[PDB]
Paper text:
Using electron cryo-microscopy (cryo-EM) and single particle analysis, we determined the organization of the tail proximal extremity of siphophage T5 that possesses a long flexible tail and solved the structure of its tail terminator protein p142 (TrP142). In siphophages, functional tails are produced after capping of the tail tube by the tail terminator proteins (TrP), of which siphophage λ gpU is the prototype. TrPp142 is resolved as a hexameric ring, interacting with the last tail tube protein TTPpb6 ring. TrPp142 is a 161-residues protein, mainly formed by a four-strand antiparallel β-sheet that lines the lumen of the tube, flanked by two α-helices, and a short loop between β-strands 1 and 2.
T5 tails, purified from a capsid defective mutant, were produced, vitrified for cryo-EM characterization, and imaged for the data collection on a high-end electron microscope. The estimated resolution of this map is 3.9 Å, which allowed us to build pseudo-atomic models for both TrPp142 hexamer and a TTPpb6 trimer. As the TrPp142 hexameric ring sits on top of a TTPpb6 trimeric ring, it exhibits a C3/pseudo-C6 symmetry and two consecutive TrPp142 monomers are not strictly identical. However, TTPpb6 also exhibits a C3/pseudo-C6 symmetry as it results in domain duplication (excluding its Ig-like domain); thus, the two consecutive TrPp142 monomers are almost superimposable (rmsd = 1.02 Å over 156 residues). The unsharpened cryo-EM map of the T5 tail proximal extremity shows a 25 Å diameter large, cylindrical, and ill-defined density filling the tail tube lumen to the top of TrPp142, which disappears from the map after interaction with FhuA. This density most probably belongs to the N-terminus of the Tape Measure Protein pb2 (TMPpb2), which fills the entire tail tube in native phages and purified tails. In the lumen of the tail tube before interaction with the receptor, densities of much lower resolution are present, which we attribute to TMPpb2. Thus, there is no unassigned density in this proximal extremity map of the tail that could account for TCPp143.
Numbering used by the authors:
A (entry chain A), E (entry chain C): 1 to 159
B (entry chain G): 1 to 464
C (entry chain B): 1 to 156
D (entry chain H): 1 to 310
The structure:
């Protein structure tokens, strides 16, 4: 029982959905849905601002009554150009993504059982470890790595 | 040949010993903090005399057997049951046993009874010598064992721990009896995958925890941002055991002690108005013998979105003298105990559990006791015929519009606060008299304790 | 609600405002406002003394009542030439920066909002955890590192 | 809206409550081991009877209030004051309070009296029911609070800790009263940069610490190299509080106990003549009921060069 | 409030002052004032024995009453030639420097305020971490790195 890519797809869809002009007083930017679950290379990326959602290691734990706490890391990377300056635009994007990640309810995704039914579910909690900007990169191209651990629980097994 | 692992331990709770089904037995999910057993006393005799070459020896004897002890921690999981569409929690039998001694009845108004909106446990109707009688069945790998009859002694909820909310149960029992045969099919009684999927998303996060606190005598509301705290329900269970010497004994009956809804809080020191400084200064300076505080610790916070939340309400709770701490950032600690209005009334406090809590629902639970029942949020007065002025010796029986329209307390009290120009009664027929050349202010208070005011000043003069 | 660049701009603005000719007794030198958090190539550095504010990692921990503790690390670099004695000049700059960081009130930074609601907020902690300088560089050129880890609680 | 940090806490000690100046109030420098507060008692009553459906409930009451408590550590800083060119220490008011109950008088011969050469504290003239009455004023960032009246109960000096010499004060008080207005201008009363610069170089290091020990009955001196030790002055203070039941009470007076200048030492066993072996063997062999030893712990060591020492 | 270079210059001046022939029964060697606060490179050095006083990092700690315990590292390096042997001469130099560092009072340096007044001051204490000889270097040229942390306190600030 794993929900890695499902959680990542839910994260991408949530970021895309809660960034349009419907909430100008809640969020700064507007990605127009330029959120993808994978990036080939930074050289391949053609549009800015652009955000990629990576998949990290996936730790598991065990509980006496058959439960299983299972942690997943979600390193999120963003890119932007020097329309005005790297610092202000990158900070705006990072704070806006933080507002997306901290407000609202839980991460809702779709779990597809092998039988042929997709049951919507909800993740437990979201916590950010650290945010970092990659200085020393190209002069007009920036980076702001924000590290996140989505903690979810699979359907009960190991009976 | 097989070794029993803790990772494969399942604890089942039942209110009966035979004829098990899904309504009397229920599986609950525990954490690594699981313990059980039963320790024994032992008397030892020895001789002593002044003769040479003494008799060095002893003979141990078993004399009695202490009551068994068990303890485990479970997450708080308020969810809705598709069978009845009523909010319940997986460990509701434990709540009922800790709250009341009568038979389990989820549709009542006492004990642990659920509503279509929230599952709330009422500590009224707990005046019994023994609580609900549960038998704890323990499955570990393959061997079956159980505790004969348990009465929960304590329940701890802690918000200082950063993980999701947990409740720490602790009780006692008569005897830990090992079992030779399986009492019931584990899967049929235990929770299914559907319930696990439905409750997997109803965890309560302690990252988002608020508190409402207010002194009744001074009518001051405080904004304390919590950094930690806990509240513990204690029944003070004391066991009874015959002490016959010929044979090993077993405890027979348990006597309840004193109900104790004791809790504690801590927060940073914030100079902002009505902050922790205001509470600290008021409590220390006033130095009253007893306080009447209305604390409300709300796990999961209150948001306009429908989100799960666990609520503790402690009406007229006593608050001790705050003690200031000293570390990298100054913080104070407030400890409170929820005393009742009358020693036998049993209105010390009540809890609330739901998965679709809202700010309005939480507020009307705080000021009404239940989530479903509405509560007044604003009140304005209106005169009979919309007249804002009056003369000497005139009758103006004003009315009041209530908000929201579904409030249960549609009646209020009529009072006069500022000015002496007219008098009113409970009915509302306001009348004035002669020699009145001044304006008066009419005030009202909701009978449900919400505390909403409707203000108006009528310019009563000598007339034309 | 991170405001890390806001904190860096508050650092730069405070450094530019203080350590000027208005108070020549409490400070050694005059930068003439030659402060900018935006870094440049070392060969591109126009005149000395020059100060650059680098923003590094930024950790955080949570609190029960929606409070958030966010530790921002702000490495600071000063470059200056050996006009008279390079070791003494960097000494003076480091002492002045320490005085600016320690004395006075807490940081004042302006937090902006999407609907033009800009209001001022202040941080709590300002500690220079360590100070190190690099030697073996080009003889006229110098560099010193001052590590401030500003600790701030973001609004809400 | 502001949060109070411990890093910005300044402790002021004064012997009066009004009309403050630089001769009656003085600022002292504390360490991270700072604590203060005032805990409260509580009596709890309950009922018990054999009837069915018993009365389960209780009602807490406050009955009295314990004496306040505070404790902080400060470095030993003997320096000279340019006003009078007499040796003093920043925490001399605390020494006077711990040493005597009479009024403060630096030019005398009892209590805490200083000289042109050294500042010495004499425990003679301490036979009083209460020591010097000080009010501790605590500033934390922007909020002012103070303890009503404190009497120093203990002082510990530890040489085992490798850092420079420190004294650990500890006392009690009548009541911890929060304050609404600033009593005095903090900078005028507090120490200036000149005194800080003058005393920054007068620290006492425990790396250099010698001891003189000698038995008067035998007239034999020992060369004992210390590896650790401490001495503690304790006044054994005890507070009196009425126990009226109708209203919450406050302690009114304190009674001094028994003066106790208890200390301890430790050293390696060295076979050299008149070493620790000689002391060990003599003390074990004689097994006298009471000994008359003349010990002298010298923090900072003694050298021909003019160097600070306690 | 920093006194790195002032402390290093005071250390250099103390070493140069307390090594002449005035105290032959206290000290072995005599550098004739060949003590400098910086060395460009080992190959540049022309006279032996020669000692360089490097400048290390600067740790800082804060105290409740506005005080500030702030530390400084003083790696000291010496050089000598094979007149007799590396071991004995380097040991004599290191033991001499240790005797200088352990006896006497404190470090007296000169602190120059921006107003134009230089007040002599005194550092608090001195502790040796370790002394090390750099074996494997050139056959006639030796090295003996002695590490020192000078602990001192700046003028009271951070009020």
């Amino acid at each position: 029982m794993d929900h890695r890519t499902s959680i990542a797809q839910a994260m991408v869809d949530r970021i895309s959905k809660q960034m349009d002009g419907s909430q100008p007083d809640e969020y700064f930017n507007n990605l127009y849905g330029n959120v993808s679950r994978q990036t080939y290379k930074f050289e391949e990326i053609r549009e800015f601002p652009y955000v990629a959602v990576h998949i990290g290691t996936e730790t598991g734990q065990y509980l006496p009554s058959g439960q299983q706490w299972m942690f997943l890391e979600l390193p999120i990377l963003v890119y932007d150009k020097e329309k005005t300056d790297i610092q202000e635009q990158l900070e705006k994007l990072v704070a806006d993504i933080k507002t997306v990640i901290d407000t609202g309810g839980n991460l809702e995704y779709t779990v597809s059982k092998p039988n042929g039914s997709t049951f919507p579910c909800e993740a437990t909690d979201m916590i950010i470890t650290s945010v970092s900007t990659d200085e020393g990169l190209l002069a007009p191209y920036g980076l702001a790595e924000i590290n996140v651990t989505v903690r979810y629980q699979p359907p009960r097994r190991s009976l | 040949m097989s070794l029993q692992l803790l990772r494969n331990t399942r604890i089942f709770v039942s209110t009966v010993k035979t004829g098990h089904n899904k309504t009397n037995t229920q599986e609950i999910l525990v954490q690594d903090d699981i313990s059980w057993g039963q320790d024994s006393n032992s008397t030892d005799i020895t001789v002593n005399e002044a003769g040479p070459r003494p008799t060095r020896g002893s003979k141990r004897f078993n004399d009695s057997l202490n009551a068994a002890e068990w303890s485990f921690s479970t997450y708080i999981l308020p969810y809705k049951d598709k069978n009845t569409s009523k909010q319940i929690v997986p460990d509701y039998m434990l709540w009922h046993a800790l709250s009341s001694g009568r038979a389990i009845n989820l549709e009542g108004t006492t004990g642990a009874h659920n509503n279509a909106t929230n599952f709330m446990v009422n500590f009224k109707d707990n005046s019994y010598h023994e609580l609900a009688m549960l038998h704890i069945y323990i499955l570990t790998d393959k061997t079956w064992s159980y505790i004969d009859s348990c009465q929960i002694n304590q329940a701890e909820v802690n918000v200082d721990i950063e993980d999701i909310g947990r409740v720490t149960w602790s009780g006692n029992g008569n005897q830990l009896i090992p079992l030779d045969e399986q009492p019931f099919d584990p899967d049929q009684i235990g929770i299914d995958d559907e319930t696990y999927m439905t409750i997997q998303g109803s965890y309560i996060k302690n990252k988002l925890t608020i508190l409402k606190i207010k002194d009744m005598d001074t009518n001051k509301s405080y904004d304390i941002p919590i950094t930690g705290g806990t509240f513990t329900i204690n029944n003070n269970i004391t066991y009874l055991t015959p002490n016959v010497m010929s044979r090993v004994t077993i405890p027979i009956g348990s006597f309840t002690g004193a109900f104790e809804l004791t809790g504690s809080l801590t927060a940073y020191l914030n100079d902002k108005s009505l902050g922790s400084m205001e509470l600290y200064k008021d409590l220390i300076k006033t130095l009253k013998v007893v306080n009447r505080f209305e604390i409300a610790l709300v796990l999961g916070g209150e948001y306009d979105d429908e989100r799960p939340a666990a609520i503790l309400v402690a009406k007229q709770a006593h608050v001790n003298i705050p003690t200031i701490e000293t570390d990298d950032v100054l913080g104070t600690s407030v400890e409170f105990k929820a005393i009742p209005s009358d020693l036998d009334a049993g209105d010390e406090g009540y809890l609330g559990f739901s998965s679709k809590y809202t700010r309005t629902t939480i507020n009307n639970l705080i000021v009404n006791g239940d989530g479903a029942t509405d509560a007044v949020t604003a009140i304005t007065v209106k005169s009979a015929g919309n007249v804002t002025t009056l003369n000497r010796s005139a009758t103006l029986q004003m009315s009041v519009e209530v908000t929201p329209s579904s409030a249960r307390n549609k009646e209020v009290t009529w009072a006069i606060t500022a000015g002496d120009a007219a008098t009113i009664n409970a009915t509302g027929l306001l009348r004035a008299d002669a020699s009145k050349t001044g304006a008066v202010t009419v005030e009202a208070t909701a009978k449900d304790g919400s505390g909403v005011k409707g203000t108006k000043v009528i310019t009563v003069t000598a007339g034309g």
